[PDB]
Design an enzyme around this catalytic site. Structure first.
Site, PDB file in Angstrom:
ATOM      1  N   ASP A 154       0.818  -1.210   0.000  1.00  0.00           N
ATOM      2  CA  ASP A 154       0.000   0.000   0.000  1.00  0.00           C
ATOM      3  C   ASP A 154       0.849   1.256   0.000  1.00  0.00           C
ATOM      4  O   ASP A 154       0.479   2.225  -0.628  1.00  0.00           O
ATOM      5  CB  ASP A 154      -0.926   0.004   1.200  1.00  0.00           C
ATOM      6  CG  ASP A 154      -2.097  -0.919   1.039  1.00  0.00           C
ATOM      7  OD1 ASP A 154      -2.378  -1.334  -0.093  1.00  0.00           O
ATOM      8  OD2 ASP A 154      -2.738  -1.231   2.054  1.00  0.00           O
ATOM      9  N   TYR A 170      -0.148 -13.798  11.531  1.00  0.00           N
ATOM     10  CA  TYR A 170       0.872 -14.035  10.483  1.00  0.00           C
ATOM     11  C   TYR A 170       2.048 -13.067  10.676  1.00  0.00           C
ATOM     12  O   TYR A 170       3.206 -13.423  10.330  1.00  0.00           O
ATOM     13  CB  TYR A 170       0.197 -13.928   9.117  1.00  0.00           C
ATOM     14  CG  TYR A 170       1.157 -14.053   7.973  1.00  0.00           C
ATOM     15  CD1 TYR A 170       1.561 -15.296   7.505  1.00  0.00           C
ATOM     16  CD2 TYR A 170       1.704 -12.917   7.398  1.00  0.00           C
ATOM     17  CE1 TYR A 170       2.500 -15.406   6.486  1.00  0.00           C
ATOM     18  CE2 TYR A 170       2.627 -13.010   6.368  1.00  0.00           C
ATOM     19  CZ  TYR A 170       3.026 -14.257   5.914  1.00  0.00           C
ATOM     20  OH  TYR A 170       3.929 -14.344   4.897  1.00  0.00           O
ATOM     21  N   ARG A 171       1.758 -11.869  11.198  1.00  0.00           N
ATOM     22  CA  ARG A 171       2.743 -10.774  11.387  1.00  0.00           C
ATOM     23  C   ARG A 171       2.261  -9.875  12.528  1.00  0.00           C
ATOM     24  O   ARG A 171       1.040  -9.617  12.603  1.00  0.00           O
ATOM     25  CB  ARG A 171       2.828  -9.993  10.076  1.00  0.00           C
ATOM     26  CG  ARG A 171       3.988  -9.018   9.983  1.00  0.00           C
ATOM     27  CD  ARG A 171       4.022  -8.473   8.576  1.00  0.00           C
ATOM     28  NE  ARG A 171       5.003  -7.413   8.365  1.00  0.00           N
ATOM     29  CZ  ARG A 171       5.019  -6.613   7.305  1.00  0.00           C
ATOM     30  NH1 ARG A 171       4.083  -6.717   6.373  1.00  0.00           N
ATOM     31  NH2 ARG A 171       5.973  -5.708   7.177  1.00  0.00           N
TER      32      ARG A 171
END
Ligand SMILES: Cc1cc2nc3c(=O)[nH]c(=O)nc-3n(C[C@H](O)[C@H](O)[C@H](O)COP(=O)(O)OP(=O)(O)OC[C@H]3O[C@@H](n4cnc5c(N)ncnc54)[C@H](O)[C@@H]3O)c2cc1C
Ligand SMILES: Cc1cc2nc3c(=O)[nH]c(=O)nc-3n(C[C@H](O)[C@H](O)[C@H](O)COP(=O)(O)OP(=O)(O)OC[C@H]3O[C@@H](n4cnc5c(N)ncnc54)[C@H](O)[C@@H]3O)c2cc1C
Ligand SMILES: COc1cc(CCCO)cc(OC)c1O
Ligand SMILES: COc1cc(CCCO)cc(OC)c1O
Lengths: 524, 523
Positions: free
Chosen positions: B148, B468-469
């Protein structure tokens, strides 16, 4: 009586009793007849070079853990097979002569789960390509496997040597998703999203949280894999396989330069494209004696007679197209226009060719649509007592590179009285030159020539910047030896990890040239 | 600020030895210079993650020597490329007091682009903007895959397994070869680069033996000095579209239609995203414009957001690539399938261009590897706005999306935080990416946000959805959820860390992996 290196007869006797105590007397094999069955079928040195002192068949992960703890107590080296069909690479024979083979596939052979909608299987090591195929045909028919040429091998075992097939899911390690692995002191761990208890995502993203470890268990002696996920492609609504024959050995340069731009976006060359030489093609449908019965390499007119008699080119391209027949026709149109730039090029579809010369085309049509086959084993009827060793270095997908390799390898093969039977395969942005070096396994001189030839092919390829991707037991130290940037930095990294996870030097010593401290610098 | 474990004597002796290697200008100890390496979106305490110094090595040889000095004096070293890890701690070290190794300041060169074979060899300081700007000028047939925001590191984003939205969206997947300085100072190349004179480093991710690159991602096992990445060929034509869905409850059908159209990588050719009203209202407006009251946003304002901006509750963005005839055929399939949802409205990047089209036009850029910073408008939603990432993995099944939607927004309400969230399907996995927006300048907002996120992670985990993060503050908790077989995965990571890092130097506690000298001492 075969003893593991570094183990007393007494300690070996104690270990065998302890292994029987876990798996059952039936699943500890020490008899010469049962061991001979784990001989490399295609030895390249002697044949006595890589032997099993025993074969242990554990029932389940828990037994894998206990046999590993027993191995640690007594210093028993253990090698690992799934189905042990690693032909070209040692078969089921251990790198370390005298190792005990852990046969994971004999009893751990279950398809644990198949999700039709999310397109994955959770597998045990004994599941063959044939097994999984049969299961999908019966229970999840919208899905298809990706198989290598033969399909009597293990979906797990092949992925763990980073093998490949020819559908869009050809890179087996890529589509591997999650593992259960027994570490070298007998701890068990699940990788990725499997490490989260009750997770439903083990097979749908390969990574999980923190460092991603699965690669370290491929071409590796860091663990015994007991369960492995693999993603499964949906069957497309339709498919078509084609053959392009090319007359001239010098066509290779232009064929590869047209192939790359057509493959790098995975369309129009939708599957893994292969370019096979006349020999690899002739050898499935004929014997060497049919074309030539003299000594020395096959003469040009023998080659020319194969081209004419079988309707083939020196180079034979095989590709499959997938999807609605309108897309297939269109993509096939782009393919025909592009490769048609090459004078002498001829195009045949799987429904247009049905003669001796089309055997490979029809076999490729099965393999490229995830239908497993043993047809390519007819290649081992080329000469009596035929065996093969694999040579498959990586190159840039550029014609000049292809031509260089073609010439270097053939010239050396001619010198060593070995036929040039090879194929060039492009994955996406990389090229593989896969040569099948055929030889009389029953002739000590032929074995020695094949080993000498392969060592030379590896050094010369490496001097040109072309690294070997996968190799035989006999060649692992030399191949790892070529990857010696930073005064052998990669191997020192591997040794540091091996010695930490495996302080007693137990799991498949010498795999990928990675030796634990107690066996390294002992010349085996 | 001193590094934990280290005496001041040893610190100054190392700072001196650092100065001899990198030079006086590239060892920063001033509280003014250190202030720029603060986590800008701190969660809980804003002083929780501080640097004792920042060192900017010129090259691999200097990284090696600074790592050897670190090992001599027991100095923990954390690591950045561009340190824009915003939502995850920015350039702030997990171990408070660590010395930050700033690889991106001086190691910022594009080392090689091959146009025909479609790759770059990159140093850490190359930003998405840098690489885009390079390609347009010298390799125009190629395009980047960017997240992004464009100001991040092609390398650093790959090493945290970040993502963009082109078919090359999985940055780690396309990462091809790397050069790494191991924790004691040795340098090594992965894959084909381990062969001297190799011509294939960036063409295949795997070399000959065990495949190691993965172990250098979300990892403290080394400092990456060079990274290869595959680069996608620009298709002949592109078009980005927006599907607006009226109902909250449409999420279930949207995800169940999405999966079969994405799993074959067609017709959903790029990474499909489904953004909620708050996520694409918050670009192009402030919360103040819709509600000045107390507590959660009531249903009336979501609606006035919807109507004023012509957005749905759920906003699907995708891109199609190829010749126009393939684009139109693929667009027809997507319309026919998602059009089965009543209230479905479809618009392309060619046929909107209004205030509510800002996100569609930004997706058109990001989905074509044009990088942008337009999504930073989002951080004007409220005064002093920061965010923390919450992004668990689930099956791409409508039932799972609805459960996650409900359970996340119910807890968000309770903790007075807006529900601004994305559902993303990679290939056969779903990500629930929630942006928890808070006032960074308000201790209560910061405390509540940490509390909320801890609870979200535990409830997600109890449901079988793993993160996941995550942020520095959450790494121990997140690793603790992955505890199959009595913590087997962390015990493995600890054994490798202790073997490669016997002196416990590189980024201690990254992903919850602590070297022996620092383990179980509560940071
Ligand atoms: C004519 C011919 C054609 C071939 N074509 C192809 C081809 O197209 N593609 C291809 O990939 N290969 C090919 N091969 C090689 C071989 O046939 C296949 O790779 C075969 O699938 C490998 O044997 P397998 O599956 O039984 O694996 P196994 O022999 O069971 O295992 C392979 C290796 O993986 C490791 N291993 C296995 N199980 C475990 C475990 N549980 N835990 C840890 N490590 C483990 C060991 O290192 C072992 O030696 C070909 C060979 C020939 C002769
Ligand atoms: C509004 C918003 C939107 C976002 N959207 C996205 C998105 O779409 N996708 C996405 O992926 N992220 C996204 N993020 C998160 C973040 O902005 C990006 O991931 C960003 O690219 C990461 O920062 P960086 O590139 O500077 O990496 P860095 O901060 O330089 O590095 C990231 C981490 O990698 C490791 N590392 C870095 N360099 C090295 C090295 N040389 N050796 C070893 N380890 C190293 C460290 O653990 C470090 O903390 C978003 C954030 C916000 C606020
Ligand atoms: C894709 O990998 C391989 C392919 C072949 C096919 C040989 C020509 O049909 C043989 C191998 O090993 C001996 C391989 O590893
Ligand atoms: C794909 O991964 C991320 C996407 C975003 C964008 C959030 C909604 O636009 C933010 C992240 O970190 C906070 C991510 O990791």
């Amino acid at each position: 009586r075969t003893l593991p290196p570094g183990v007393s007869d007494e300690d070996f006797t104690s270990a065998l009793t302890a292994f029987r105590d876990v798996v059952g007397d039936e699943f500890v094999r020490t008899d010469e007849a049962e061991l001979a069955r784990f001989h490399d079928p295609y030895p390249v040195g002697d044949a006595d070079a890589h032997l099993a002192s025993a074969v242990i068949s554990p029932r389940d992960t828990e037994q894998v853990q206990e046999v590993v703890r027993i191995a640690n107590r007594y210093g028993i080296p253990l090698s690992v097979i799934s189905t042990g069909r690693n032909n070209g690479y040692g078969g089921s024979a251990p790198r370390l002569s005298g190792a005990v083979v852990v046969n994971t596939g004999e009893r751990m052979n279950r398809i644990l789960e198949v999700d039709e909608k999310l397109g994955y299987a959770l597998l045990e090591p004994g599941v063959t390509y044939f097994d999984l195929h049969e299961y999908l045909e019966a229970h999840a028919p919208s899905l298809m496997i990706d198989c290598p040429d033969l399909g009597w091998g293990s979906v797990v075992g092949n992925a763990l040597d980073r093998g490949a097939g020819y559908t869009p899911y050809g890179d087996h390690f890529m589509w591997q998703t999650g593992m259960e692995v027994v570490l070298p002191q007998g701890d068990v761990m699940r990788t990725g999203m499997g490490a989260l208890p009750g997770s439903t995502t083990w097979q749908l993203i390969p990574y999980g949280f923190g460092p991603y470890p699965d690669g370290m268990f491929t071409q590796s002696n860091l663990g015994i894999v007991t369960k492995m996920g693999i993603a499964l492609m949906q069957k497309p609504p339709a498919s078509m396989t084609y053959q392009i024959t090319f007359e001239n050995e010098s066509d290779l340069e232009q064929i590869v330069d047209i192939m790359l731009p057509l493959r790098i976006n995975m369309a129009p060359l939708q599957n893994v494209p292969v370019l096979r030489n006349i020999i690899l093609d002739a050898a499935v449908v004929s014997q060497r004696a049919d074309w030539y019965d003299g000594d020395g390499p096959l003469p040009p007119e023998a080659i020319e007679r194969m081209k004419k008699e079988l309707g083939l080119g020196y180079w034979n391209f095989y590709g499959t197209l997938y999807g609605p027949p309108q897309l297939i026709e269109m993509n096939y149109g782009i393919i025909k226009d592009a490769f048609g730039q090459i004078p002498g090029s001829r195009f045949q579809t799987h429904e247009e060719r049905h003669d001796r010369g089309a055997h490979v085309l029809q076999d490729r049509h099965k393999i490229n649509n995830g239908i497993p086959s043993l047809s390519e084993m007819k290649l081992m009827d080329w000469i009596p007592g035929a065996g093969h060793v694999g040579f498959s270095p990586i190159s840039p997908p550029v014609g000049r590179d292809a031509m260089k390799q073609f010439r270097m390898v053939r010239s050396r093969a001619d010198e060593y009285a070995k036929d040039y039977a090879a194929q060039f395969v492009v994955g996406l942005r990389e090229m593989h030159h896969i040569a099948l070096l055929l030889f009389d396994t029953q002739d000590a001189t032929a074995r020695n020539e094949t080993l000498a030839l392969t060592r030379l092919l590896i050094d010369e390829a490496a001097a040109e910047g072309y690294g070997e991707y996968r190799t035989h037991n006999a060649l692992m130290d030399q191949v790892m030896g070529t990857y010696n940037w930073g005064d052998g930095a990669l191997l020192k990294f591997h040794e540091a990890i091996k010695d930490a996870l495996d302080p007693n030097g137990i799991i498949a010593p010498g795999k990928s040239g990675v030796w634990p401290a107690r066996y390294r610098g002992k010349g085996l």
